[PDB]
Enzyme design. Sequence first.
Site, PDB file in Angstrom:
ATOM      1  N   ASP A  52      37.377  68.614  45.463  1.00  9.21           N
ATOM      2  CA  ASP A  52      36.030  68.397  44.964  1.00  9.21           C
ATOM      3  C   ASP A  52      36.020  67.904  43.526  1.00  9.21           C
ATOM      4  OD1 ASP A  52      36.088  69.815  47.284  1.00  9.21           O
ATOM      5  OD2 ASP A  52      34.598  71.311  46.704  1.00  9.21           O
ATOM      6  N   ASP A  95      35.388  67.467  55.553  1.00 14.18           N
ATOM      7  CA  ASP A  95      34.645  68.649  55.144  1.00 14.18           C
ATOM      8  C   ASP A  95      33.694  69.063  56.249  1.00 14.18           C
ATOM      9  OD1 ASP A  95      35.890  68.104  52.648  1.00 14.18           O
ATOM     10  OD2 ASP A  95      34.242  69.167  51.651  1.00 14.18           O
TER      11      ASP A  95
END
Length: 274
Positions: free
Chosen positions: A192, A153
């Site tokens: 997520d 990320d």
Amino acid sequence: DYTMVVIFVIAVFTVALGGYWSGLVELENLKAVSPLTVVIFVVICCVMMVLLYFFYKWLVYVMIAIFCIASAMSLYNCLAALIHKIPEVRLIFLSGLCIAVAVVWAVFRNEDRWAWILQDILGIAFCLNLIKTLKLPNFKSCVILLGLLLLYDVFFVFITPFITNNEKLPVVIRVPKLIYFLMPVSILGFGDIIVPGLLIAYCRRFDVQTGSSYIYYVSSTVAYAIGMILTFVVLVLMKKGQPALLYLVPCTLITASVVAWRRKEMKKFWKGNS
């Protein structure tokens, strides 16, 4: 907007149900009865992203088809359990319903008025199945995977500014602005919900293995919810799209470590009950 409250509920009961469902499977196994592969996971993985970047046209449709098939299978598996609890023709009817929903979503992909609900249902089923089936063996693997994807990320947020066909990847969960329901978007990816979902499932599984309680599962789920709230607060305050993992990985890993340390149950948690 009334989507930060909806996508907070969709992304928390999917994780909490997945962790609880995973711990329910582990309870039957007790009743009735990796550190070195990270390099290969990095290589292969990033190779897939490179291929997507270079061959987007003819490689987005294969991803869409894979999502359709996997989501149909996961939806069938999820909806099977609820009716199994309820007191074959019914099973084939459910299979037909699931494949019909998947094919209807595949045909109506770009109809952004009502395809979002079908994508959300299919994605919730897919995540609820991936949180349960994928068995992380020990908290060492949990830490390694979560840290690696947090680094991914970080690369996502640190590389895209340097750079700066009509299809859309189904890897995301789409919700329009639920204030007058063109419609804007409220996107939250599968990584997520699944990546910390596996850690909360592992916490529940370890809790089931060690005695009978709810400390690890409740603590992990509460910390995940707090991390989601922090992500939303940062998004509201700083007008910038911040990746959710950056605030979901520390909040869950740190609380799991604290719970393990303050319970004399770290050695087993890190090595695994095996």
